[PDB]
Design an enzyme around this catalytic site. Sequence first.
Site, PDB file in Angstrom:
ATOM      1  N   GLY A  51     107.661 -30.413 -32.131  1.00 42.11           N
ATOM      2  CA  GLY A  51     108.485 -30.705 -30.926  1.00 42.11           C
ATOM      3  C   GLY A  51     109.751 -31.496 -31.175  1.00 42.11           C
ATOM      4  N   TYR A  81     113.199 -35.841 -47.099  1.00 40.68           N
ATOM      5  CA  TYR A  81     113.480 -34.907 -48.222  1.00 40.68           C
ATOM      6  C   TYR A  81     114.892 -34.496 -48.244  1.00 40.68           C
ATOM      7  CZ  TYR A  81     109.023 -33.413 -50.372  1.00 40.68           C
ATOM      8  OH  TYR A  81     107.824 -33.332 -51.069  1.00 40.68           O
ATOM      9  N   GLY A 122     112.992 -27.348 -53.901  1.00 42.22           N
ATOM     10  CA  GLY A 122     113.497 -28.663 -54.392  1.00 42.22           C
ATOM     11  C   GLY A 122     112.423 -29.666 -54.746  1.00 42.22           C
ATOM     12  N   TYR A 124     109.801 -31.886 -57.193  1.00 41.87           N
ATOM     13  CA  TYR A 124     110.022 -32.450 -58.565  1.00 41.87           C
ATOM     14  C   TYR A 124     109.540 -31.462 -59.617  1.00 41.87           C
ATOM     15  CZ  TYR A 124     110.835 -37.139 -56.740  1.00 41.87           C
ATOM     16  OH  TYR A 124     111.233 -38.285 -56.105  1.00 41.87           O
ATOM     17  N   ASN A 142     122.645 -47.162 -61.684  1.00 39.33           N
ATOM     18  CA  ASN A 142     123.942 -46.888 -61.087  1.00 39.33           C
ATOM     19  C   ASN A 142     124.757 -45.921 -61.941  1.00 39.33           C
ATOM     20  OD1 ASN A 142     125.586 -47.608 -58.751  1.00 39.33           O
ATOM     21  ND2 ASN A 142     127.082 -48.269 -60.298  1.00 39.33           N
ATOM     22  N   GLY A 143     124.692 -46.014 -63.281  1.00 39.50           N
ATOM     23  CA  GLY A 143     125.358 -45.037 -64.130  1.00 39.50           C
ATOM     24  C   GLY A 143     124.885 -43.604 -63.977  1.00 39.50           C
ATOM     25  N   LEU A 145     123.470 -42.448 -61.358  1.00 36.81           N
ATOM     26  CA  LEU A 145     123.918 -41.992 -60.028  1.00 36.81           C
ATOM     27  C   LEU A 145     125.415 -41.518 -59.994  1.00 36.81           C
ATOM     28  CD1 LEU A 145     122.913 -41.278 -57.183  1.00 36.81           C
ATOM     29  CD2 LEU A 145     123.323 -43.575 -56.537  1.00 36.81           C
ATOM     30  N   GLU A 178     113.155 -41.791 -52.425  1.00 33.52           N
ATOM     31  CA  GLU A 178     112.047 -42.615 -52.826  1.00 33.52           C
ATOM     32  C   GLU A 178     112.265 -44.073 -52.619  1.00 33.52           C
ATOM     33  OE1 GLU A 178     109.338 -41.091 -53.169  1.00 33.52           O
ATOM     34  OE2 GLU A 178     109.596 -39.372 -54.497  1.00 33.52           O
ATOM     35  N   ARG A 181     111.477 -44.650 -49.008  1.00 32.76           N
ATOM     36  CA  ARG A 181     110.046 -44.550 -48.735  1.00 32.76           C
ATOM     37  C   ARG A 181     109.319 -45.819 -49.214  1.00 32.76           C
ATOM     38  NH1 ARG A 181     110.372 -38.842 -51.421  1.00 32.76           N
ATOM     39  NH2 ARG A 181     110.674 -37.528 -49.563  1.00 32.76           N
ATOM     40  N   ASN A 196     123.103 -53.713 -64.516  1.00 36.45           N
ATOM     41  CA  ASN A 196     123.783 -52.489 -64.974  1.00 36.45           C
ATOM     42  C   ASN A 196     123.185 -51.882 -66.237  1.00 36.45           C
ATOM     43  OD1 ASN A 196     125.800 -50.609 -64.447  1.00 36.45           O
ATOM     44  ND2 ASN A 196     127.112 -51.464 -66.085  1.00 36.45           N
ATOM     45  N   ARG A 198     120.567 -48.821 -67.102  1.00 34.24           N
ATOM     46  CA  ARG A 198     119.758 -47.607 -66.821  1.00 34.24           C
ATOM     47  C   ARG A 198     118.445 -47.532 -67.557  1.00 34.24           C
ATOM     48  NH1 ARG A 198     124.961 -44.232 -67.537  1.00 34.24           N
ATOM     49  NH2 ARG A 198     123.547 -42.454 -67.896  1.00 34.24           N
TER      50      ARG A 198
HETATM   51  N1  LIG Z   1     114.434 -32.330 -52.636  1.00 35.69           N
HETATM   52  C1  LIG Z   1     113.418 -33.210 -52.654  1.00 35.69           C
HETATM   53  N2  LIG Z   1     112.394 -33.072 -53.481  1.00 35.69           N
HETATM   54  C2  LIG Z   1     111.387 -33.914 -53.452  1.00 35.69           C
HETATM   55  N3  LIG Z   1     110.288 -33.691 -54.173  1.00 35.69           N
HETATM   56  C3  LIG Z   1     109.255 -34.550 -54.087  1.00 35.69           C
HETATM   57  C4  LIG Z   1     107.994 -34.285 -54.870  1.00 35.69           C
HETATM   58  O1  LIG Z   1     107.841 -33.259 -55.543  1.00 35.69           O
HETATM   59  N4  LIG Z   1     106.917 -35.026 -54.605  1.00 35.69           N
HETATM   60  C5  LIG Z   1     105.654 -34.848 -55.395  1.00 35.69           C
HETATM   61  C6  LIG Z   1     104.537 -34.691 -54.388  1.00 35.69           C
HETATM   62  N5  LIG Z   1     104.429 -35.967 -53.703  1.00 35.69           N
HETATM   63  C7  LIG Z   1     104.234 -36.154 -52.384  1.00 35.69           C
HETATM   64  O2  LIG Z   1     103.451 -37.038 -52.034  1.00 35.69           O
HETATM   65  N6  LIG Z   1     104.955 -35.340 -51.609  1.00 35.69           N
HETATM   66  C8  LIG Z   1     105.214 -35.212 -50.262  1.00 35.69           C
HETATM   67  C9  LIG Z   1     104.246 -35.359 -49.235  1.00 35.69           C
HETATM   68  C10 LIG Z   1     104.668 -35.132 -47.917  1.00 35.69           C
HETATM   69  C11 LIG Z   1     105.978 -34.798 -47.580  1.00 35.69           C
HETATM   70  C12 LIG Z   1     106.912 -34.669 -48.594  1.00 35.69           C
HETATM   71  C13 LIG Z   1     106.493 -34.871 -49.929  1.00 35.69           C
HETATM   72  C14 LIG Z   1     109.336 -35.767 -53.368  1.00 35.69           C
HETATM   73  N7  LIG Z   1     110.425 -35.991 -52.624  1.00 35.69           N
HETATM   74  C15 LIG Z   1     111.492 -35.087 -52.600  1.00 35.69           C
HETATM   75  C16 LIG Z   1     112.656 -35.224 -51.814  1.00 35.69           C
HETATM   76  O3  LIG Z   1     112.787 -36.225 -51.077  1.00 35.69           O
HETATM   77  N8  LIG Z   1     113.618 -34.283 -51.850  1.00 35.69           N
END
Ligand SMILES: Nc1nc2nc(C(=O)NCCNC(=O)Nc3ccccc3)cnc2c(=O)[nH]1
Length: 268
Positions: A51, A81, A122, A124, A142-143, A145, A178, A181, A196, A198
Amino acid sequence: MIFPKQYPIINFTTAGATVQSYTNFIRAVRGRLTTGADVRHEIPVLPNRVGLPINQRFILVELSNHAELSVTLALDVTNAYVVGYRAGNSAYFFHPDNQEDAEAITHLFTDVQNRYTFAFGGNYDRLEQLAGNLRENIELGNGPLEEAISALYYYSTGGTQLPTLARSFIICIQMISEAARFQYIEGEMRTRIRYNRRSAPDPSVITLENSWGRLSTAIQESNQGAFASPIQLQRRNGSKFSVYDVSILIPIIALMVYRCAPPPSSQF
Ligand SMILES: Nc1nc2nc(C(=O)NCCNC(=O)Nc3ccccc3)cnc2c(=O)[nH]1
Protein backbone atom coordinates in the site's frame (compact mmCIF):
# COMPACT_ATOMS: atom_id res chain seq x y z
CA MET A 1 3.73 21.17 -16.65
CA ILE A 2 5.50 19.24 -13.81
CA PHE A 3 3.23 16.54 -12.07
CA PRO A 4 3.48 17.19 -8.15
CA LYS A 5 6.19 16.52 -5.36
CA GLN A 6 9.50 14.85 -6.55
CA TYR A 7 11.58 12.59 -4.26
CA PRO A 8 13.75 14.03 -1.45
CA ILE A 9 17.49 14.47 -2.25
CA ILE A 10 20.28 14.30 0.32
CA ASN A 11 23.75 15.59 -0.71
CA PHE A 12 27.16 14.25 0.35
CA THR A 13 30.66 14.93 -0.90
CA THR A 14 33.84 13.04 -0.34
CA ALA A 15 35.82 16.25 -0.93
CA GLY A 16 37.10 17.37 2.53
CA ALA A 17 34.76 15.01 4.26
CA THR A 18 34.97 14.64 7.97
CA VAL A 19 33.41 12.43 10.67
CA GLN A 20 30.86 15.20 11.29
CA SER A 21 29.88 15.72 7.66
CA TYR A 22 29.50 11.98 7.09
CA THR A 23 27.46 11.63 10.32
CA ASN A 24 25.21 14.46 9.22
CA PHE A 25 24.72 12.71 5.85
CA ILE A 26 23.81 9.30 7.33
CA ARG A 27 21.44 10.90 9.95
CA ALA A 28 19.73 12.72 7.09
CA VAL A 29 19.38 9.53 4.99
CA ARG A 30 17.80 7.72 8.00
CA GLY A 31 15.48 10.69 8.50
CA ARG A 32 14.16 10.37 4.93
CA LEU A 33 13.92 6.60 5.00
CA THR A 34 11.66 6.39 8.12
CA THR A 35 8.51 8.25 9.02
CA GLY A 36 8.42 7.76 12.80
CA ALA A 37 5.27 5.63 12.40
CA ASP A 38 6.95 2.47 13.51
CA VAL A 39 9.52 1.97 16.24
CA ARG A 40 9.96 -1.32 18.07
CA HIS A 41 12.30 -1.78 21.04
CA GLU A 42 13.56 1.72 20.27
CA ILE A 43 14.47 0.63 16.71
CA PRO A 44 12.80 2.31 13.73
CA VAL A 45 11.17 0.12 11.12
CA LEU A 46 11.11 1.10 7.40
CA PRO A 47 7.76 1.65 5.65
CA ASN A 48 5.77 -1.36 4.67
CA ARG A 49 5.87 -1.92 0.88
CA VAL A 50 2.19 -3.00 1.01
CA GLY A 51 0.00 0.00 0.00
CA LEU A 52 2.94 2.43 -0.02
CA PRO A 53 2.16 5.18 -2.54
CA ILE A 54 4.63 5.58 -5.46
CA ASN A 55 5.27 9.23 -4.47
CA GLN A 56 6.77 8.12 -1.16
CA ARG A 57 8.68 5.11 -2.47
CA PHE A 58 12.21 6.54 -3.13
CA ILE A 59 14.90 8.92 -1.91
CA LEU A 60 17.82 10.30 -3.93
CA VAL A 61 21.41 10.54 -2.76
CA GLU A 62 23.49 12.98 -4.73
CA LEU A 63 27.20 12.14 -4.36
CA SER A 64 29.97 14.47 -5.43
CA ASN A 65 33.78 14.23 -5.82
CA HIS A 66 36.95 16.23 -5.19
CA ALA A 67 37.20 15.49 -8.98
CA GLU A 68 34.06 17.73 -9.37
CA LEU A 69 31.92 14.88 -10.54
CA SER A 70 28.40 13.95 -9.35
CA VAL A 71 26.20 10.86 -9.51
CA THR A 72 22.74 10.36 -7.99
CA LEU A 73 21.81 7.09 -6.38
CA ALA A 74 18.14 6.07 -5.95
CA LEU A 75 17.24 4.19 -2.73
CA ASP A 76 14.02 2.27 -2.12
CA VAL A 77 12.57 3.36 1.29
CA THR A 78 11.21 -0.12 2.02
CA ASN A 79 14.68 -1.65 2.39
CA ALA A 80 17.29 1.15 1.85
CA TYR A 81 18.43 -0.70 -1.33
CA VAL A 82 20.28 1.12 -4.08
CA VAL A 83 18.10 0.36 -7.09
CA GLY A 84 19.97 2.44 -9.69
CA TYR A 85 21.72 5.61 -10.42
CA ARG A 86 22.00 8.60 -12.74
CA ALA A 87 25.20 10.11 -14.17
CA GLY A 88 24.36 13.14 -16.44
CA ASN A 89 22.26 11.80 -19.41
CA SER A 90 22.33 8.11 -18.58
CA ALA A 91 20.56 6.11 -15.85
CA TYR A 92 21.12 2.49 -14.95
CA PHE A 93 18.91 0.19 -12.86
CA PHE A 94 19.61 -3.23 -11.45
CA HIS A 95 17.43 -6.04 -12.72
CA PRO A 96 14.15 -5.79 -10.79
CA ASP A 97 13.01 -8.63 -8.50
CA ASN A 98 9.43 -8.43 -9.73
CA GLN A 99 6.93 -6.63 -11.96
CA GLU A 100 5.76 -4.14 -9.32
CA ASP A 101 9.44 -3.01 -8.80
CA ALA A 102 9.93 -2.65 -12.56
CA GLU A 103 6.94 -0.30 -12.72
CA ALA A 104 8.12 1.58 -9.72
CA ILE A 105 11.52 2.36 -11.17
CA THR A 106 9.88 3.99 -14.20
CA HIS A 107 9.13 6.80 -11.77
CA LEU A 108 12.81 7.57 -11.28
CA PHE A 109 15.03 9.90 -13.40
CA THR A 110 12.11 10.41 -15.73
CA ASP A 111 13.80 12.96 -18.07
CA VAL A 112 17.14 11.20 -18.67
CA GLN A 113 17.78 10.56 -22.41
CA ASN A 114 19.31 7.11 -21.94
CA ARG A 115 17.74 4.52 -19.63
CA TYR A 116 19.13 1.07 -19.16
CA THR A 117 18.25 -1.82 -16.99
CA PHE A 118 21.15 -4.14 -16.30
CA ALA A 119 20.49 -7.72 -16.95
CA PHE A 120 21.91 -8.67 -13.46
CA GLY A 121 20.37 -7.89 -10.04
CA GLY A 122 22.16 -5.69 -7.51
CA ASN A 123 22.65 -8.16 -4.55
CA TYR A 124 26.21 -8.53 -3.11
CA ASP A 125 26.62 -12.08 -4.41
CA ARG A 126 26.01 -11.03 -8.03
CA LEU A 127 28.18 -7.90 -7.65
CA GLU A 128 31.04 -9.79 -6.05
CA GLN A 129 30.99 -12.26 -9.01
CA LEU A 130 31.11 -9.34 -11.46
CA ALA A 131 33.83 -7.54 -9.46
CA GLY A 132 36.01 -10.58 -9.23
CA ASN A 133 36.34 -9.78 -5.54
CA LEU A 134 34.45 -10.49 -2.29
CA ARG A 135 33.45 -7.72 0.11
CA GLU A 136 36.17 -8.87 2.48
CA ASN A 137 38.79 -7.93 -0.13
CA ILE A 138 37.36 -4.52 -1.15
CA GLU A 139 38.65 -1.56 0.81
CA LEU A 140 36.15 1.03 2.10
CA GLY A 141 36.64 4.60 3.27
CA ASN A 142 36.63 8.07 1.82
CA GLY A 143 39.23 7.29 -0.89
CA PRO A 144 37.33 4.23 -2.19
CA LEU A 145 34.16 6.38 -2.19
CA GLU A 146 35.77 9.28 -4.14
CA GLU A 147 37.09 6.72 -6.69
CA ALA A 148 33.73 4.91 -6.85
CA ILE A 149 31.92 8.20 -7.66
CA SER A 150 34.28 8.80 -10.61
CA ALA A 151 33.89 5.16 -11.78
CA LEU A 152 30.10 5.39 -11.85
CA TYR A 153 30.25 8.74 -13.57
CA TYR A 154 32.50 7.44 -16.45
CA TYR A 155 30.54 4.18 -17.13
CA SER A 156 28.50 5.78 -20.01
CA THR A 157 31.61 6.46 -22.01
CA GLY A 158 33.47 3.14 -21.75
CA GLY A 159 35.92 4.42 -19.20
CA THR A 160 34.83 2.07 -16.51
CA GLN A 161 35.13 -1.68 -16.94
CA LEU A 162 32.31 -3.90 -15.52
CA PRO A 163 34.41 -5.33 -12.71
CA THR A 164 35.26 -1.76 -11.60
CA LEU A 165 31.60 -0.64 -11.83
CA ALA A 166 30.43 -3.64 -9.67
CA ARG A 167 33.21 -2.93 -7.11
CA SER A 168 32.17 0.78 -7.03
CA PHE A 169 28.54 -0.28 -6.30
CA ILE A 170 29.80 -2.53 -3.50
CA ILE A 171 31.57 0.50 -1.96
CA CYS A 172 28.55 2.81 -2.27
CA ILE A 173 26.04 0.35 -0.89
CA GLN A 174 28.08 -0.36 2.25
CA MET A 175 29.01 3.27 2.89
CA ILE A 176 25.48 4.58 2.44
CA SER A 177 22.79 1.81 2.84
CA GLU A 178 24.61 -0.36 5.32
CA ALA A 179 25.71 2.60 7.36
CA ALA A 180 22.11 3.85 7.47
CA ARG A 181 20.93 0.37 8.55
CA PHE A 182 23.58 -0.09 11.31
CA GLN A 183 25.12 2.47 13.67
CA TYR A 184 27.87 -0.01 14.05
CA ILE A 185 28.75 0.16 10.29
CA GLU A 186 28.34 4.00 10.32
CA GLY A 187 30.93 3.95 13.20
CA GLU A 188 33.31 1.76 11.09
CA MET A 189 33.11 4.25 8.24
CA ARG A 190 33.61 7.25 10.68
CA THR A 191 36.89 5.60 11.84
CA ARG A 192 38.20 5.20 8.29
CA ILE A 193 37.25 8.85 7.43
CA ARG A 194 38.70 10.27 10.67
CA TYR A 195 42.17 8.70 9.95
CA ASN A 196 41.86 8.84 6.14
CA ARG A 197 42.80 5.18 6.06
CA ARG A 198 40.98 2.76 3.75
CA SER A 199 40.46 -0.83 4.82
CA ALA A 200 38.29 -3.80 3.93
CA PRO A 201 35.37 -4.67 6.22
CA ASP A 202 36.13 -7.20 9.00
CA PRO A 203 33.84 -10.14 9.91
CA SER A 204 31.83 -8.01 12.41
CA VAL A 205 30.70 -5.79 9.42
CA ILE A 206 30.21 -8.60 6.98
CA THR A 207 28.11 -10.81 9.38
CA LEU A 208 25.90 -7.83 10.30
CA GLU A 209 25.29 -7.08 6.56
CA ASN A 210 24.51 -10.69 5.87
CA SER A 211 22.17 -10.92 8.84
CA TRP A 212 20.06 -7.72 8.45
CA GLY A 213 16.91 -9.44 7.23
CA ARG A 214 17.19 -12.22 9.79
CA LEU A 215 17.79 -9.83 12.63
CA SER A 216 14.80 -7.69 11.51
CA THR A 217 12.57 -10.71 11.52
CA ALA A 218 13.94 -12.12 14.84
CA ILE A 219 13.32 -8.73 16.56
CA GLN A 220 9.84 -8.37 15.16
CA GLU A 221 8.87 -11.99 16.05
CA SER A 222 10.48 -11.85 19.50
CA ASN A 223 8.66 -12.48 22.71
CA GLN A 224 9.05 -9.12 24.52
CA GLY A 225 12.48 -8.86 22.94
CA ALA A 226 13.62 -12.45 23.51
CA PHE A 227 14.55 -14.41 20.38
CA ALA A 228 13.11 -17.96 19.99
CA SER A 229 16.30 -18.94 18.25
CA PRO A 230 19.59 -17.19 18.76
CA ILE A 231 21.45 -15.62 15.83
CA GLN A 232 25.18 -16.04 15.50
CA LEU A 233 27.28 -13.07 14.44
CA GLN A 234 31.04 -12.60 14.42
CA ARG A 235 33.32 -10.23 16.31
CA ARG A 236 36.17 -8.37 14.56
CA ASN A 237 38.58 -11.19 15.18
CA GLY A 238 36.09 -13.67 13.59
CA SER A 239 35.06 -15.36 16.86
CA LYS A 240 31.34 -16.20 17.32
CA PHE A 241 28.96 -13.84 19.20
CA SER A 242 25.46 -15.14 20.04
CA VAL A 243 22.49 -12.71 20.00
CA TYR A 244 19.60 -13.84 22.21
CA ASP A 245 17.68 -10.54 22.59
CA VAL A 246 17.03 -7.22 21.04
CA SER A 247 18.66 -5.39 23.93
CA ILE A 248 22.29 -5.98 22.75
CA LEU A 249 21.32 -4.74 19.22
CA ILE A 250 19.90 -1.28 20.28
CA PRO A 251 23.39 0.36 19.91
CA ILE A 252 24.07 -1.62 16.69
CA ILE A 253 21.05 -1.66 14.33
CA ALA A 254 19.42 1.58 13.35
CA LEU A 255 16.68 0.51 10.97
CA MET A 256 14.84 -2.75 10.24
CA VAL A 257 12.95 -3.95 7.13
CA TYR A 258 9.19 -4.35 7.82
CA ARG A 259 8.40 -8.06 8.20
CA CYS A 260 5.37 -8.59 10.34
CA ALA A 261 2.68 -6.36 11.83
CA PRO A 262 3.57 -5.40 15.58
CA PRO A 263 1.52 -7.41 18.03
CA PRO A 264 -0.93 -5.58 20.33
CA SER A 265 0.52 -3.70 23.31
CA SER A 266 3.52 -1.45 22.11
CA GLN A 267 3.07 2.09 20.44
CA PHE A 268 0.42 3.18 23.00
N1 LIG B 1 21.93 -2.70 -4.62
C1 LIG B 1 21.94 -3.16 -3.36
N2 LIG B 1 22.38 -4.38 -3.07
C2 LIG B 1 22.35 -4.84 -1.84
N3 LIG B 1 22.64 -6.11 -1.58
C3 LIG B 1 22.55 -6.56 -0.31
C4 LIG B 1 22.85 -8.01 -0.01
O1 LIG B 1 23.11 -8.82 -0.90
N4 LIG B 1 22.55 -8.47 1.20
C5 LIG B 1 22.88 -9.89 1.58
C6 LIG B 1 21.62 -10.49 2.15
N5 LIG B 1 21.35 -9.78 3.38
C7 LIG B 1 20.15 -9.35 3.82
O2 LIG B 1 19.89 -9.49 5.02
N6 LIG B 1 19.39 -8.81 2.87
C8 LIG B 1 18.18 -8.14 2.82
C9 LIG B 1 17.03 -8.48 3.57
C10 LIG B 1 15.87 -7.73 3.35
C11 LIG B 1 15.81 -6.67 2.45
C12 LIG B 1 16.95 -6.34 1.73
C13 LIG B 1 18.12 -7.11 1.93
C14 LIG B 1 22.29 -5.70 0.78
N7 LIG B 1 21.97 -4.43 0.53
C15 LIG B 1 21.95 -3.93 -0.78
C16 LIG B 1 21.59 -2.61 -1.14
O3 LIG B 1 21.25 -1.80 -0.25
N8 LIG B 1 21.59 -2.24 -2.43
